[PDB]
Design a protein around this ligand. Structure first.
Ligand SMILES: *C/C=C(C)/C=C/C=C(C)/C=C/C1=C(C)CCCC1(C)C
Ligand SMILES: CCCCCCCC/C=C\CCCCCCCC(=O)O
Ligand SMILES: CCCCCCCC/C=C\CCCCCCCC(=O)O
Ligand SMILES: CCCCCCCCCCCCCCCCCCCC
Ligand SMILES: CCCCCCCCCCCCCCCCCCCC
Ligand SMILES: CCCCCCCCCCCCCCCCCCCC
Ligand SMILES: CCCCCCCCCCCCCCCCCCCC
Ligand SMILES: CCCCCCCCCCCCCCCCCCCC
Ligand SMILES: CCCCCCCCCCCCCCCCCCCC
Ligand SMILES: CCCCCCCCCCCCCCCCCCCC
Ligand SMILES: CCCCCCCCCCCCCCCCCCCC
Ligand SMILES: CCCCCCCCCCCCCCCCCCCC
Ligand SMILES: CCCCCC
Ligand SMILES: CCCCCC
Ligand SMILES: CCCCCC
Ligand SMILES: [Kr]
Ligand SMILES: [Kr]
Ligand SMILES: [Kr]
Ligand SMILES: [Kr]
Ligand SMILES: [Kr]
Ligand SMILES: [Kr]
Ligand SMILES: [Kr]
Ligand SMILES: [Kr]
Ligand SMILES: [Kr]
Ligand SMILES: [Kr]
Ligand SMILES: [Kr]
Ligand SMILES: [Kr]
Ligand SMILES: [Kr]
Ligand SMILES: [Kr]
Ligand SMILES: [Kr]
Ligand SMILES: [Kr]
Ligand SMILES: [Kr]
Ligand SMILES: [Kr]
Ligand SMILES: [Kr]
Ligand SMILES: [Kr]
Ligand SMILES: [Kr]
Ligand SMILES: [Kr]
Ligand SMILES: [Kr]
Ligand SMILES: [Kr]
Ligand SMILES: [Kr]
Ligand SMILES: [Kr]
Ligand SMILES: [Kr]
Ligand SMILES: [Kr]
Length: 225
């Protein structure tokens, strides 16, 4: 399986990212700051587990569509189901979002990843893209609440919080927006690029969205109470 190279590198970078965050957090006692270390280290730990599972051949299924048997890594969606809500919780704790907003984001993130997977398992080529469209609408709902709602909340807090939140907000909009496009061009969608290139592109986005995001958050004074 040519994609195995990117599964192995993906596992190695998520694993080292998780260990990095844990070692950096050992120099921290602030209760507020520890909550962000715990969440931010768990995200690449979950991704490490799912990349290792896919590398060893677990979390793969064949879906017939477009008159072919198509390899679909469903473990990718299992990873995203747990990690995308932890990343949204990092942002929600930074701007001290209320519990209702937190539930609405988790729910919307559940629809985004759930309909993602339904589309990936859909046997009628055409309907794959209806589910992609619903998943994308849910992502746009999330990015709207983050970009407009959370910025407004962050601007009513201390400037250190507004400043860190804006950088994390900018990275999230850019990286999250790439995912639906990679799905469209990859083996899950139109099959313009082969599985091994889809895997490489998801791996770069995942490492950027977990380790990159995590470095920006945990280097900031905004996480201290
Ligand atoms: C750690 C990984 C992260 C930040 C993953 C993000 C994943 C997405 C934003 C996925 C979104 C998708 C759509 C909006 C369209 C349909 C397919 C998905 C699931 C790739
Ligand atoms: C600049 C990046 C913004 C990304 C988050 C929003 C994603 C798109 C979702 C729905 C459309 C929102 C309408 C945007 C108009 C701008 C309004 C304003 O700046 O006052
Ligand atoms: C499209 C979404 C509409 C239906 C979704 C169901 C429930 C979500 C309602 C939550 C409202 C969001 C308020 C968050 C904020 O204050 O920015
Ligand atoms: C921490 C995860 C690292 C996984 C790396 C896998 C690379 C080793 C596989 C051996 C390759 C066989 C070719 C000979
Ligand atoms: C949630 C579980 C936590 C995972 C921790 C394990 C991560 C291991 C990181 C690997 C370090 C890379 C160094 C050598 C890789 C060689 C690859 C060839
Ligand atoms: C490597 C293993 C990763 C552990 C990351 C978990 C940190 C906090 C979890 C919450 C309790
Ligand atoms: C306090 C609020 C807590 C929130 C609850 C879920 C959908 C699963 C559908 C899968 C079925 C396919 C066989
Ligand atoms: C047969 C395919 C099963 C799809 C179910 C998708 C799981 C969605 C989980 C939602 C969690 C909400 C938070
Ligand atoms: C940026 C494109 C947004 C419009 C989504 C429309 C796709 C619907 C899929 C229908 C399949 C036939
Ligand atoms: C009405 C249609 C809404 C679609 C617009 C999407 C929201 C804006 C996001 C733009 C961010 C840049 C794109 C990211 C790709 C870069 C990959 C690295
Ligand atoms: C980004 C890099 C794109 C490289 C693609 C090269 C593969 C050519 C075969 C295309 C058919 C895919 C099924
Ligand atoms: C077929 C293409 C050959 C390219 C080989 C070069 C391998 C380098 C790719 C590794 C990408 C690492 C992930 C980057 C994430 C950046 C964010 C860090 C935080
Ligand atoms: C056929 C794979 C189903 C995915 C389980 C969440
Ligand atoms: C392992 C924690 C996942 C919850 C979202
Ligand atoms: C699906 C679009 C979400 C934006 C809310 C105004
Ligand atoms: Kr590797
Ligand atoms: Kr550690
Ligand atoms: Kr956590
Ligand atoms: Kr996991
Ligand atoms: Kr895990
Ligand atoms: Kr596994
Ligand atoms: Kr799995
Ligand atoms: Kr799983
Ligand atoms: Kr998982
Ligand atoms: Kr988990
Ligand atoms: Kr969460
Ligand atoms: Kr996020
Ligand atoms: Kr959240
Ligand atoms: Kr909710
Ligand atoms: Kr929910
Ligand atoms: Kr979720
Ligand atoms: Kr899922
Ligand atoms: Kr579409
Ligand atoms: Kr999808
Ligand atoms: Kr960015
Ligand atoms: Kr970015
Ligand atoms: Kr986009
Ligand atoms: Kr998109
Ligand atoms: Kr496409
Ligand atoms: Kr990418
Ligand atoms: Kr990227
Ligand atoms: Kr980043
Ligand atoms: Kr860090």
């Amino acid at each position: 399986r040519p994609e195995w190279i990117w599964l192995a590198l993906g596992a190695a970078l998520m694993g080292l990212g998780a260990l990095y965050f844990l070692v950096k957090g050992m120099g921290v006692s602030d209760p507020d700051a520890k909550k962000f270390y715990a969440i931010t280290a768990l995200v690449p730990a979950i991704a490490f587990t799912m990349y290792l599972s896919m590398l060893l051949g677990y979390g793969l299924t064949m879906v017939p569509f477009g008159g072919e048997q198509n390899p679909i890594y469903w473990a990718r969606y299992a990873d995203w189901l747990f990690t995308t809500p932890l990343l949204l919780l990092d942002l929600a704790l930074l701007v001290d979002a209320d519990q209702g907003t937190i539930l609405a984001l988790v729910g919307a993130d559940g629809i985004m990843i759930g309909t993602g997977l339904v589309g990936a398992l859909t046997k009628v080529y055409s309907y794959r893209f209806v589910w992609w469209a619903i998943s994308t609408a849910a992502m746009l709902y999330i990015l709207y609440v983050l970009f407009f709602g959370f910025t407004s909340k962050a601007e009513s807090m201390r400037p250190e919080v507004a400043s860190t939140f804006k950088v994390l907000r900018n990275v999230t909009v850019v990286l999250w927006s790439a995912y639906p496009v990679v799905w469209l061009i990859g083996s899950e969608g139109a099959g313009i690029v082969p599985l091994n290139i889809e895997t490489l592109l998801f791996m770069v986005l995942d490492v950027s969205a977990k380790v990159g995001f995590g470095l920006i958050l945990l280097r900031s004074r905004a996480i201290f109470g």
